[PDB]
Every structure is written in C-alpha cells, then in structure tokens.
C-alpha cells in the first residue's frame, strides 16, 4: 500500500558537520513516520518517533522533522559512533535504508604477519594471516608471495566496518595451505600496496 | 528493565521450518503486540506480521501468508514466529519487535527490539569451531605495538562471538567477519593490538563462543620467543 523512497543511499561526512536524509511517502501518513540507528551486526535502535520526538535515551544531536508525505532525518553534529544504516518507517514499509560513513584523513596500515601455529599444523592445515591494522582509505590491494612466486585462489580477505572511535578499518588476508605445502616452502610474503611483511618458516 | 530475549541461531535444512522464540520481561505482557521483521545478508528490513498476545490474533504480510505461524504464551510470556517450507533466500536475521503506546489502534513505533535469530537455511550440518593462538613475536611486533589473536576456523553455521579478557579488554580489538571457504565452513579472526612491554606481563584470554554448536572456548595467547 505505502512506499517509502529513502535517500541518498549512502552518505560520507566528516566529523561535526550536519548529516540531512529525506524520506518520502506515496501518500498522506500525517506525522506516522520512524527513524531508526542498525549499527553493523545489532538490532534496529529506535531514534525518533513519530517524524518529531526523540526517543527516550536518544542523544539530542537527533532530530526529525515533516508532516504529510515529505519528512527528514538530522544529526546536527556528526560523532565517530555515529557510523549505521538508517532507516525510515511507516506502519508495513521500511524505506531503503542510508548507510551514513565518515571521511578521515589518510592513514597508514600496521601490517604484521603470524605463521600457522603448531596446534593448527597438528591437524594437516596450514594458515598463515595477513593483518592489516587501523588505515583509511578502505582500498588496499594484498597478494601473497611463496617463495616469492605469486599466489592466487588459495587467500581470503575480510575487512571490519568503520571504527567508531577513530574511523579506521582494518583487513585481514589469510593464505590457506595444506601441511605439506607449507612445509614445502621458507618464505611466505604479504604485499600490501607497497610495503612487505614475510618471515622464515624454519624462524 | 523492559527486554526482549529471543532463542539462539539454528540451521535449517530446505523445507523443514523454524520456529523462533521471543520472551518479553519488564512489563505486562498482553499490553503491547509483537511484531516480526526480517534481514536478508546485506539487505533492508521487511516487516513479516504481527500478533495480539491477548486473544492471539494475528495479521500476516502476504508475502509470507500461509507459510507463517504467529503463537503465543502468556504464562510465560513467549510469542512465537514458525516459518515453514524453508527457502534457501529465507536465510536472515529474525528479530521480533514491541511498539510504543498508542491510541490511534496501530502503534508501529518499535522502541524495543530483540537481538535477532540467525536462521541459516542449508543441509550442511552443525560443527563446532577449532580455536588456534595467533602468538605474537617480532614478525607480529611493529613499533613499540604488538599485534596478538585468535583464530577461529571450521564452523558451521555463523555466528560465532569473540572477546577479549571476559570482555575486560576491548581497546584496539577487531573481529573481523567471518569468511565463507570454498570447504562450505566458516571462519574469522580476532586481533588486538596491545603494546609491546605488556607482553610476558600482562594475560591476553580470548573468549570464542559458537551457540550453534554448544561450544564455549577460552584461549590463553602467549607470546612467542623469536
């Protein structure tokens, strides 16, 4: 019955500076209409109710406003725990959502190394981890060097969400290989573009 | 304090169903209704249906119509969501939801919401996670920052929870989101970054739970001598 067009998609804002989303209904909802905060991997928390209200607990840097078919979303001063989805709501319909991020100066990423330990070698698996600690931009390019000979389609990545204290984000490259392999080679190099971590497997 | 506690993540095979569990505390029961909302991975949230907790009735999004089940029991103040004839895209975080008071006879301002069912649709079965020290040496040692973890590695189905010191030692922590393996197993590491003069002195437990399995695992990281 009702649609809801939610806008933007995404947003990048530096911290303190005023974030706005919009939210537009297909039809006359009075002042019937929710703001809700989805931090990654949490449950919906309700900020505004009722298009004006903030909601008991909420920070005040919180507001709403509209009436009828046209309603926004406002945090007046942008915090670094401020980094969610946004959502907007009438009765059945949740509009599309606004994935707020924050801009950051550039930082560099702590790359350290950890060989496979000898309980995960007891068992036939080698896994040797990459880890790429607190740098911004997200993009990062990391490739693994055996001997150094390049490697493919035996290396996963995983990259955490913003930080919400300092808006870093941090990677991690895992080389799977089996016992055999592992111990079939010395020098195991992670590349991040360009600096390098390797060791010795011997060491 | 008002809480909603729901039962804990599951894998379903396809076409069997799940039934997921929601119990309120806090306050009367009978006064609010629960609702359902649904999260696909990396999707929005899709409002299922609701159910009056005083008689039972129950008002169900047509997309689900037929398909679904909205229970409930007041004794001990439980409603219930069955999902039924389970799809591979019914894979998604189930949360169950209470509304605001109203007078206008339909109150959706959620103001409490559960923490969310992970139900995973597959027939791979359930395994428990093997948890393996991420031992900090030179090789993990950049400035005066050293760099220690966890690694936790073929589980089935997600999630699994990590933290640091029973939770004491949250600071400079990562745990990264699980990875899919080309084996159909789970697996993810926790970091953190501690300085280097702590260690040999100060204790580093990591705390990795796998409610799917029933597994608890707690791991004293120690550092390395090269």
């Known amino acids: 019955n009702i649609q809801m067009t939610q806008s933007p998609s995404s947003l990048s804002a530096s911290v303190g500076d005023r974030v706005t989303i919009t939210c537009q209904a297909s039809?006359?909802?009075?002042?019937?209409l929710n703001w809700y905060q989805q931090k990654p991997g949490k449950a919906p928390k309700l900020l505004i109710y009722?298009?004006?209200n903030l909601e008991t607990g909420v920070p005040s840097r919180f507001s709403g406003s509209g009436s009828g078919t046209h309603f926004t979303f406002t945090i007046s001063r942008l915090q670094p725990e401020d980094i969610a989805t946004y959502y907007c709501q009438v009765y059945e319909t949740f509009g599309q959502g606004t994935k707020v991020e924050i801009k950051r100066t550039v930082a560099a990423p702590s790359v350290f190394i950890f060989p496979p330990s000898d309980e995960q070698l007891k068992s036939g698996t080698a896994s040797v981890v990459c880890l790429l600690n607190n740098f911004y931009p997200r993009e990062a390019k990391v490739q693994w060097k055996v001997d150094n000979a390049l490697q493919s389609g035996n290396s996963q990545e995983s990259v955490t969400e913003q930080d919400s204290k300092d808006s870093t984000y941090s990677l991690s490259s895992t080389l799977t290989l089996s016992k055999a392999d592992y111990e079939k080679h010395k020098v195991y190099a992670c590349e991040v573009t360009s600096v390098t971590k390797s060791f010795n497997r011997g060491e | 304090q008002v809480q909603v506690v729901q039962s804990g993540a599951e894998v379903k095979k396809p076409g069997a169903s799940v039934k997921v569990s929601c119990k309120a505390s806090?306050?009367?029961?009978?006064?609010?209704?629960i609702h359902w909302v649904r999260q696909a991975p990396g999707q929005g949230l899709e409002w299922m249906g609701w159910?009056?907790?005083?008689?039972?009735?129950?008002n169900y999004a047509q997309k689900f119509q037929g398909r679904v089940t909205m229970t409930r029991d007041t004794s001990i103040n439980t409603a219930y969501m069955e999902l039924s004839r389970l799809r591979f895209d019914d894979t998604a975080v189930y949360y169950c939801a209470r509304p605001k008071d109203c007078s206008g006879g339909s109150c959706y301002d959620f103001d409490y919401w559960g923490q969310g069912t992970l139900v995973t649709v597959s027939s791979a079965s359930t395994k428990g996670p093997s948890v393996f020290p991420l031992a900090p040496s030179s090789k993990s040692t950049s400035g005066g920052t050293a760099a220690l973890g966890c690694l936790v590695k073929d589980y089935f189905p997600e999630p699994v929870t990590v933290s640091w010191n029973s939770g004491a030692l949250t600071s400079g922590v990562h745990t990264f989101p699980a990875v899919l393996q080309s084996s159909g197993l789970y697996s993810l590491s926790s970091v953190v970054t501690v300085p280097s003069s702590s260690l040999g002195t100060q204790t580093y437990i990591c705390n990795v739970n796998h409610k799917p399995s029933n597994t608890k695992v707690d791991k004293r990281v120690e550092p390395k001598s090269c």
């Open positions: 159910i009056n907790p005083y008689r039972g009735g129950t």
């Open positions: 806090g306050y009367t029961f009978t006064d609010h209704y």
């Open positions: 009722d298009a004006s």
């Open positions: 039809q006359d909802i009075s002042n019937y």
